[PDB]
Design a protein around this ligand. Structure first.
Ligand SMILES: [Zn+2]
Lengths: 129, 151, 87, 184, 81
RNA sequence: GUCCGACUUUAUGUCGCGCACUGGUUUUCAACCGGAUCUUUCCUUCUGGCUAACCUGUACUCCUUGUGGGUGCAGGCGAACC
């Protein structure tokens, strides 16, 4: 049973990147996947994706440009207080100069730097760098 | 590809066409289709056989495309929906058949295990239909009382 | 990479695979750099003027080096319809 | 009979459209016997690029079946009478906002009255003679969205140049840009 | 393979793949208009019919259930819908 | 504007760190956060307060003939507040 759909999407992205491809076909295509890929676009780790209406949860075709090296979900969307954001960034991101802990706040799904700018924090979705 | 109660992994199914609206070539009327559905139900047919008949002998791709309502929903609007939902009824029919086969020959252990599987499935479906209040909250499946519902 | 003064401190910016945008390791002893000669009007290979494609060792080992070179040469106007973007 | 076929406060431009409807009613054997039971909901004008214009008639909508049955003929006759103005037979549907967490209970909002569903119905009825056979959505790198609609190659001959007016109408109604493409 | 279109694959590849596995999943079946030599009524039947379909005018079967799609009768003439 | 580092018992003219304090910051800029507004786009709304405020027009205009500006009483703006 597909429990965490975003996990499947990011796993497909990782597999299709490690093999060097430039495209992925993510099947279930929820809101959260769309927002995750939109954040990745805003920061450039992804290219030009596409939603394919099925009337059936839709699908997504993702274009890459090799700039990304790893996605990944934190499957238990831990409640992250504004104090623990730095802890997650240290534990997940490889360096302080880049990388982004994509986390879901009451103000939408945002990268950790943007959430720290709004001075709001919520649950953690995943990480990209 | 789950096959809840076995090791199967098949995905044999049907792909509903993208267009929800009526097919261009269909000339029948929605009111006539609903009348046909009502007549078939009055003949004593479950919704699945009604859909099969409308797909084979007539141009009805599916009721929801043509009318806008589902077959069981259409029957319920006219008050012909059976007191026991069709899939659960067929499960009880199968269970009573296997129990008959068992009580007519004891040593068959494989059919005993299959009866256990069927009863587990019956319990699951009954729990679902009970949490949606289709069945009364006192409704339960019992081995002795299943025959009366089947018969 | 960049010191606060703005002076570069990196030893060298590495090349990147022209087909997968992945960088080329210093000791990546499988990667290649193809040179394709520019051609003038009468088919004379103009010397010292060409176009270079750095194919990584990874795609070469995988088996997609020739396909990537086909696409990459078709994009920059070297081969006519040798590669179709829709398989 | 100008006033009866329009259930809204009068406006000078729409009176001419109603008069054109009466002139359509003049012809008996096909444009009558169904067209009597007709109304309006404040037809509106949308500017199109190049000086073109798109008039959009607004059906009450409990009767979109009759308008759909009549639409092709009425469209071509109205284009004959109305030069340079493309006529589009749009629905009008009540879009409801959500109960906000701090808001108060009203009733279970049916999904048919929601923004996405209403927009889907509007775009599906932005062109009756053809049908939508595919919907693609591409989010550009710069952070803007486009909603490609793939239409049947069959019956495309009706919509030959109305594609741009459809784009303009949808953009004016929503702001969500759109690009039409016909698969081979 | 490394670079390849999925939004617009070749229609030959579309007929190649399985149903439920296309970009948008669409059935491979279709309907037919069959005429039985008996009367002039045109009956609409399914490619993969499951019942001994007969014309309402005459008790003559026009299809036959089969593990796959319908096997028509000998002298009935059909046109694809 | 303010001015301070090279000119040394002093500075300005000078060499500008490209302004060490404080502004025009609609100079296009670019954001980084908000707020109100139009969508068939609601944010709990009234019921009296209190009418805070001018869509009030009653007596009218202090003053350049100028809606800059008002003394002001019945309708009437309530998120400006009880
Ligand atoms: Zn016959």
């Amino acid at each position: 049973t597909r429990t965490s759909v975003l996990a499947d999407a990011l796993n497909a992205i990782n597999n299709a990147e490690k093999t060097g491809k430039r495209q992925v076909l993510i099947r279930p295509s929820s809101k959260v996947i769309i927002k995750f890929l939109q954040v990745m676009q805003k920061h450039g780790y992804i290219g030009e994706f596409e939603y394919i209406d099925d009337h059936r949860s839709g699908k997504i075709v993702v274009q890459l440009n090799g700039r990304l090296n790893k996605c990944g979900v934190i499957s238990p969307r831990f409640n992250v207080k504004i104090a623990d954001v730095e802890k997650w960034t240290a534990n997940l991101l490889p360096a302080r100069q880049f990388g982004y802990v994509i986390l879901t706040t009451s103000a939408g799904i945002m990268d950790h730097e943007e959430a720290h700018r709004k001075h709001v924090s919520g649950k953690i979705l995943g990480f990209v760098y | 590809m789950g096959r809840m109660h076995s090791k199967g992994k098949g995905m044999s199914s049907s792909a509903i066409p993208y267009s929800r609206n009526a097919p261009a070539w269909f000339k029948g009327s929605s009111d006539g289709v609903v009348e046909q559905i009502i007549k078939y139900a009055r003949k004593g047919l479950t919704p699945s056989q009604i859909g099969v008949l409308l797909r084979d002998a007539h141009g009805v791709t599916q009721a929801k495309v043509i009318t806008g309502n589902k077959i069981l929903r259409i029957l319920k609007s006219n008050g012909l929906a059976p007191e026991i939902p069709e899939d659960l009824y067929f499960l009880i029919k199968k269970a009573v058949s296997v129990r008959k086969h068992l009580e007519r020959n004891r040593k068959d252990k494989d059919a005993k295990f299959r009866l256990i599987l069927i009863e587990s499935r019956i319990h699951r479906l009954a729990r679902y239909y009970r949490t949606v209040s289709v069945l009364p909250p006192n409704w339960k499946y019992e081995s002795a009382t299943a025959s009366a519902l089947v018969n | 990479m960049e010191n606060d003064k703005g002076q570069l401190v990196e030893l060298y910016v590495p090349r990147k695979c022209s087909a997968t945008n992945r960088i080329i390791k210093a000791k990546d002893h499988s990667s290649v750099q193809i040179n394709i000669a520019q051609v003038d009007e009468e088919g004379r290979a103009i010397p010292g003027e060409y176009v270079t494609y750095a194919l990584s060792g990874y795609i070469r080992a995988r088996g997609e080096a020739d396909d990537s070179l086909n696409r990459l040469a078709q994009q920059d106007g070297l081969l006519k319809n040798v590669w179709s973007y829709s398989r | 009979p100008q006033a009866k076929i329009l259930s809204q406060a009068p406006t000078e431009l729409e009176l001419q459209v109603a008069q054109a409807f009466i002139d359509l009613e003049n012809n008996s054997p096909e444009l009558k016997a169904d067209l009597r039971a007709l109304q309006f909901k404040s037809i509106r004008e949308i500017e199109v690029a190049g000086g073109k214009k798109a008039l959009a008639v607004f059906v009450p909508v409990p009767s979109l079946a009759a308008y759909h049955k009549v639409q092709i003929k009425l469209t071509r006759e109205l284009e004959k009478k109305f030069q340079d103005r493309h006529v589009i037979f749009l629905a009008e549907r009540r879009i409801l906002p959500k109960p906000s967490r701090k808001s108060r209970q009203t009733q279970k909002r049916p999904r048919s009255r929601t923004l996405t569903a209403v927009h889907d119905k509007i775009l599906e009825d932005l062109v009756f003679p053809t049908e939508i056979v595919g919907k693609r959505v591409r989010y550009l790198v710069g952070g803007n969205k486009i909603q490609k609609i793939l239409l049947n190659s069959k019956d495309v001959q009706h919509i030959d140049n109305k594609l741009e007016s459809f784009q303009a109408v949808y953009n004016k109604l929503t702001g969500k840009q759109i690009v039409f493409e016909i698969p081979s | 393979v490394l670079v390849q279109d999925l939004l617009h694959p070749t229609a030959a590849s579309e007929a190649r793949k399985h149903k439920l596995k296309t970009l948008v999943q669409s059935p491979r079946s279709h309907f037919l208009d069959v005429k039985c030599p008996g009367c002039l009524n045109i009956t609409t039947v399914f490619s993969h019919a499951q019942t001994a379909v007969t014309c309402e005018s005459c008790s003559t079967v026009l299809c036959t259930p089969t593990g796959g799609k319908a096997k028509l009768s000998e002298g009935t003439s059909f046109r694809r819908k």
